[PDB]
């Protein structure tokens, strides 16, 4: 007999179907609670949390570690790339020299004194010393564990 779909309760007569969260699904019936994406096509897994079944992007958005920019004070979503210095995170466009206002980018030399960033050519001698190298941007949310991840298997009926 046909398997029943956990999404709609109907028999699955489709040639291709999904298995996830130890249920069978018509692919169209396995959708992100937030954005309605068809999980079996967009990616390889779903995330279960707080009664929802989510795509990776909405799992990150709703449950990932957001932060805040040390320069402007405003929130930074878990999905956003940030610059780092001295244990702080920054919007890319907030990561600027305090003297000349140039945006600092990976590989640039810079100084940091009490929260103020300075480019290589604006060494604040009067205030002063250590030269730092700007790292590549990284995701605000960083790495996260797979405890809520549930792989999707694409099957032929
Ligand atoms: Zn269905
Ligand atoms: Zn989604
Ligand atoms: Zn900012
Ligand atoms: Zn400068």
Coordinates of C-alpha atoms and ligand atoms in Angstrom, one line a residue:
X1 CA 0.0 0.0 0.0
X2 CA 1.0 3.6 -0.5
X3 CA 2.7 5.6 2.3
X4 CA 0.8 8.5 3.8
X5 CA 2.1 12.0 3.7
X6 CA 2.7 13.7 7.1
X7 CA 2.0 17.0 5.6
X8 CA -1.5 16.4 4.0
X9 CA -2.5 12.9 5.2
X10 CA -3.0 11.7 1.7
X11 CA -1.6 8.7 0.0
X12 CA 1.6 9.3 -1.9
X13 CA 1.3 8.0 -5.4
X14 CA 4.1 10.2 -6.7
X15 CA 7.1 8.6 -8.4
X16 CA 9.4 10.7 -6.3
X17 CA 8.9 11.5 -2.6
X18 CA 10.7 12.5 0.6
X19 CA 11.6 10.9 3.9
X20 CA 12.3 13.2 6.8
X21 CA 11.6 13.2 10.5
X22 CA 10.8 9.6 10.0
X23 CA 7.7 10.4 8.0
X24 CA 7.0 10.2 4.2
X25 CA 6.0 13.4 2.3
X26 CA 4.9 14.6 -1.0
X27 CA 7.8 17.0 -1.7
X28 CA 5.3 19.9 -2.0
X29 CA 4.0 19.1 1.5
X30 CA 7.4 19.4 3.3
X31 CA 7.7 23.2 3.5
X32 CA 9.4 25.7 5.8
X33 CA 7.0 27.0 8.4
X34 CA 8.3 30.5 7.9
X35 CA 9.0 31.0 4.2
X36 CA 7.2 28.1 2.6
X37 CA 10.3 26.9 0.7
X38 CA 10.1 23.3 -0.5
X39 CA 12.7 21.9 1.7
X40 CA 13.5 18.8 -0.3
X41 CA 14.5 20.9 -3.3
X42 CA 16.2 23.8 -1.8
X43 CA 18.6 21.9 0.4
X44 CA 19.5 18.6 2.0
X45 CA 17.9 19.0 5.4
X46 CA 15.3 20.6 7.7
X47 CA 15.5 21.9 11.2
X48 CA 12.9 21.2 13.9
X49 CA 12.4 23.6 16.8
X50 CA 9.6 25.2 18.8
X51 CA 6.9 23.4 16.8
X52 CA 8.3 24.4 13.4
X53 CA 10.0 22.8 10.5
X54 CA 12.4 25.3 9.1
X55 CA 14.9 25.8 6.2
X56 CA 18.4 26.4 7.3
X57 CA 18.2 30.2 6.6
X58 CA 15.1 30.6 8.8
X59 CA 16.5 28.4 11.5
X60 CA 19.6 30.7 11.6
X61 CA 17.4 33.8 11.5
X62 CA 15.0 32.7 14.3
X63 CA 17.5 30.7 16.5
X64 CA 21.0 31.6 15.6
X65 CA 23.2 34.0 17.6
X66 CA 22.6 37.5 16.6
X67 CA 24.9 40.2 17.9
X68 CA 25.4 43.9 17.9
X69 CA 27.8 46.4 16.3
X70 CA 30.3 47.9 18.7
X71 CA 30.5 51.1 16.5
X72 CA 26.8 52.0 15.9
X73 CA 25.2 49.8 18.7
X74 CA 22.6 48.3 16.3
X75 CA 21.7 44.7 16.0
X76 CA 23.4 42.4 13.5
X77 CA 21.5 39.3 12.3
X78 CA 23.1 35.9 12.6
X79 CA 23.2 35.7 8.8
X80 CA 25.2 38.8 8.3
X81 CA 29.0 38.9 7.7
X82 CA 30.9 41.0 10.3
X83 CA 34.4 42.3 10.9
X84 CA 36.2 41.6 14.1
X85 CA 38.6 43.4 16.4
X86 CA 39.5 43.0 20.0
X87 CA 36.5 40.8 20.9
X88 CA 34.0 43.1 19.2
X89 CA 32.0 42.7 16.1
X90 CA 31.2 45.4 13.5
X91 CA 29.0 46.0 10.4
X92 CA 31.4 46.0 7.4
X93 CA 30.5 49.6 6.7
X94 CA 31.1 50.6 10.4
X95 CA 34.6 49.1 10.5
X96 CA 36.3 52.4 9.6
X97 CA 39.3 54.5 10.6
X98 CA 38.3 57.0 13.3
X99 CA 40.5 59.7 11.7
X100 CA 40.0 59.5 7.9
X101 CA 36.8 57.4 7.8
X102 CA 38.2 54.8 5.4
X103 CA 36.5 51.4 5.5
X104 CA 39.1 48.8 6.6
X105 CA 39.2 45.6 4.7
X106 CA 41.0 42.2 5.0
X107 CA 44.8 42.5 5.0
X108 CA 44.8 46.1 6.0
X109 CA 47.1 47.1 8.9
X110 CA 45.3 48.9 11.7
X111 CA 45.5 50.1 15.3
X112 CA 42.9 49.8 18.1
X113 CA 43.0 52.0 21.2
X114 CA 40.0 51.9 23.6
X115 CA 37.4 51.1 20.9
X116 CA 38.8 53.6 18.3
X117 CA 40.1 52.0 15.1
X118 CA 42.8 53.7 13.1
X119 CA 44.2 52.8 9.7
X120 CA 48.0 52.2 9.0
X121 CA 48.5 55.8 7.9
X122 CA 46.6 57.4 10.9
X123 CA 48.7 55.8 13.7
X124 CA 47.5 57.9 16.6
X125 CA 51.0 58.8 17.9
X126 CA 49.7 61.5 20.3
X127 CA 47.4 58.9 22.0
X128 CA 50.2 56.3 22.0
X129 CA 51.2 51.0 19.2
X130 CA 50.5 47.4 18.1
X131 CA 49.8 46.8 14.4
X132 CA 47.0 44.4 13.7
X133 CA 45.9 42.8 10.4
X134 CA 42.2 42.9 9.5
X135 CA 40.8 39.4 9.2
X136 CA 38.3 38.1 6.6
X137 CA 34.7 38.7 7.4
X138 CA 32.9 35.9 9.2
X139 CA 29.2 35.1 9.9
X140 CA 27.8 36.8 13.0
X141 CA 26.1 33.5 14.0
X142 CA 29.3 31.5 13.5
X143 CA 29.3 27.8 13.6
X144 CA 26.4 26.0 15.2
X145 CA 25.6 22.5 16.2
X146 CA 23.4 20.1 14.2
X147 CA 21.2 19.0 17.1
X148 CA 18.0 20.3 15.4
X149 CA 19.0 19.2 11.9
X150 CA 17.0 16.4 10.3
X151 CA 18.3 15.2 7.0
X152 CA 15.9 14.8 4.1
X153 CA 16.2 11.7 1.8
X154 CA 14.9 11.9 -1.7
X155 CA 13.3 8.6 -2.7
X156 CA 11.8 6.9 -5.7
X157 CA 8.5 5.2 -5.0
Ligands
LIG1 ZN1 1.2 15.5 1.1
LIG2 ZN1 12.4 29.2 5.4
LIG3 ZN1 27.4 49.3 12.9
LIG4 ZN1 42.8 56.5 8.4

